[PDB]
């Protein structure tokens, strides 16, 4: 457990498929450790199959939930503008899978098309859900869409914290 008691990282829930910036408040090992970590708690890995006790800052009412490193990724603090959106590029946006024209839970989208008119910069992308995907959906949220953190290209949140708290 390498994440600290003040480590608010982006916990991608696999079940609903939605990203939520969750606050790591405790790390525990898959070895006998239910309380505050002790007795040589040095347990790193490539993808740590150890239990990060996080709290969705997007839904504080969920309280402390258990998520592993494979589940909790670093929130890449980079808002991608329309002109930086390009074909093949996957980016995370506040998206309602009930209505693409309204915001909701943070999902992925692979940019398929981009066409600006003098009334608005219009975007159409394959919005990637839990394991599913929604090809050619209007991306209204081009002003506030973040990037997916790639191997090397993934910039960490060292600058001003977001902690978007997506819980309408």
**Furthest C-alpha separation in the chain:** 63
CB 144 within 8 A of CB 134: no
Torsion on CA atoms 91, 70, 18, 80, rounded to nearest 10: -20
Q: Which domains does the chain have, with CATH numbers?
A: 1-77 (2.30.30.140), 78-168 (2.30.30.30)
CB 9 within 8 A of CB 75: yes
Enumerate residues 6+ apart whose C-beta is below 8 A from 165: 21, 57, 58
For residues 123 and 111, what is the distance between their CA atoms, to the nearest angstrom? 8
For residues 28 and 166, what is the distance between their CA atoms, to the nearest angstrom? 27
For residues 30 and 22, what is the distance between their CA atoms, to the nearest angstrom? 20
Buried b (16+ CB within 10 A) or exposed e, 94-128: bbebeebeeebbbbbbbbbebeeeeeebebbbbbb
Enumerate residues 6+ apart whose C-beta is below 8 A from 32: none
For residues 54 and 6, what is the distance between their CA atoms, to the nearest angstrom? 10
**Kind of pairing, strands 146-147 and 90-95?**
antiparallel
Q: Which residue has the tokens 């009412």?
A: 61
């Amino acid at each position: 457990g390498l994440y600290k008691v003040n480590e608010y990282v982006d916990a991608r829930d696999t079940n609903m498929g939605a990203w939520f910036e969750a606050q790591v408040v405790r790390v525990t090992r898959k070895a006998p450790s239910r309380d505050e970590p002790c007795s040589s708690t040095s347990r790193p890995a490539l993808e740590e199959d150890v239990i990060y006790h996080v709290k969705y800052d997007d839904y504080p009412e969920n309280g402390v939930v258990q998520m592993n490193s494979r589940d909790v990724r670093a929130r890449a603090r980079t808002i991608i503008k329309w002109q930086d959106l390009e074909v093949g590029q996957v980016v995370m946006l506040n998206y309602n899978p009930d209505n693409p024209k309204e915001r909701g839970f943070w999902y992925d989208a692979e940019i398929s098309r981009k066409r600006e008119t003098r009334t608005a910069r219009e975007l159409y992308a394959n919005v990637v859900l839990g394991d599913d995907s929604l090809n050619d959906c209007r991306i209204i949220f081009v002003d506030e869409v973040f990037k997916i953190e790639r191997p090397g290209e993934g910039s960490p949140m060292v600058d001003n914290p977001m902690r978007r708290k997506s819980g309408p």
